[PDB]
Subunit: 188 residues, 2 copies
């Protein structure tokens, strides 16, 4: 009776955008797997923080399904996500089974690369807007967190807490989100 | 002409409170050393995120001095910091040379353990207030970030961005802090 989250971690990911959702989701009782795109080895993030993944993506793929798939940002991280055929397979399967897909900052650009969720309202980091909107396949929002159907997006490192709590609210409900929020000492 | 920051990473540290300052300080051009209390090996944080330190504290001690020493929170992490004789030596030396000392959430309780900065105004996580105030050696503040002399404290994971930017403002000045802040998409 435990919800499951997959966080996909590639070289160049924004480490704040990775750790904040993982930590908050584990505070909410969610079973989180931090899966390394290239394997089980330690991943050098964009600001040189080095994180050990829980598993390789190959292994984690086989322990599905997941109630949410999480794509952090970071420009080079999103580029690696966008180029990965394994990411494409995971995202297409999540869309087909109507599971949640959550991406933050530059992360949403991987959705475009993999042709995921066309027609949805999305947000990105302002600097990633032009890339996300190539072709007019999505409608753009400037909300700090945006949710349309099964696609949940958010704008930047500074929105990481709101992004994570929205995942909690979607999976476990508003009361659990509010309970997890209070000890964090967030402003609003 | 490059400022230097030491972040001390112990088992049980709050991983958000570790990564956010490290990332933000590196965005500000600060040379940050993430030093592992127990050695060079990977450190399991409070919500099971595993981080590889840049060096052992023993090695990092010898490459001083540092313009700021940073103590993350997490209850078990702060307890390990409070029990460490090496932490005591580093903090006493930083105080004597009038360097900045920054601690967040439960981190400030290590200051009490090591008899650092008595008489200063400090804040902590609300749940750590009683521990920090045993003996009346500090004056308590409910400000989200508090700075008195060379002691800079902050309250919780949700204050980590404000805490980090205050370190930047202290080391590199208000203009660099404002420049680093804008791409983060913080609310205020």
């Amino acid at each position: 009776a435990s919800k499951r989250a997959l966080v996909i971690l590639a070289k160049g990911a924004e480490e704040m955008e990775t750790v904040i959702p993982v930590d908050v989701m584990r505070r909410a009782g969610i079973k989180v797997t931090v899966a390394g795109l290239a394997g089980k080895d330690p991943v050098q993030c964009s600001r040189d923080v080095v994180i050990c993944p829980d598993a390789s993506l190959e292994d984690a793929k086989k322990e599905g399904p997941y109630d949410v798939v999480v794509l952090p940002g970071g420009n080079l991280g999103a580029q690696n996500l966008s180029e990965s055929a394994a990411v494409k397979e995971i995202l297409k399967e999540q869309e087909n089974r109507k599971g949640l897909i959550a991406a933050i900052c530059a992360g949403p650009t991987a959705l475009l690369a993999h042709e995921i969720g066309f027609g949805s309202k999305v947000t990105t980091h302002p600097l990633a807007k032009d890339k996300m909107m190539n072709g007019g396949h999505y409608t753009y929002s400037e909300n700090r967190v945006e949710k349309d159907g099964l696609i949940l997006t958010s704008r930047g490192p500074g929105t990481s807490f709101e992004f994570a709590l929205a995942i909690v609210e979607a999976l476990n409900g508003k009361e659990v989100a509010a309970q997890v929020k209070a000890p964090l000492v967030l402003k609003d």
